[PDB]
Amino acid sequence: IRVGCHKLINHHIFTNLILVFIMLSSAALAAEDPIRSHS
């Protein structure tokens, strides 16, 4: 069956946790040091 995953996908809780993981990922990307590669 392929019904037990749709509720988890479209749940209100699961649409506001990944939206902050992506913000943290972008922030971590923005904090990279361009000069010091081995730092």
- DSSP string of 9-35, one letter each residue: HH-TTHHHHHHHHHHHHHHHHHT--SS
Q: How was this structure determined?
A: cryo-EM
Task: Give this entry's resolution in angstroms.
Answer: 3.1
What gap in Å lies between CA 24 and CA 26, rounded to an integer?
A: 5
| DSSP element (H, E) containing 5 | none
| Token pair listed for 22 | 């992506």
Decide: helix, strand or coil at residue 37: coil
C-alpha neighbours within 13 Å on the C-beta side of residue 10: 4
CA–CA separation, 29 vs 23, rounded Å?
10
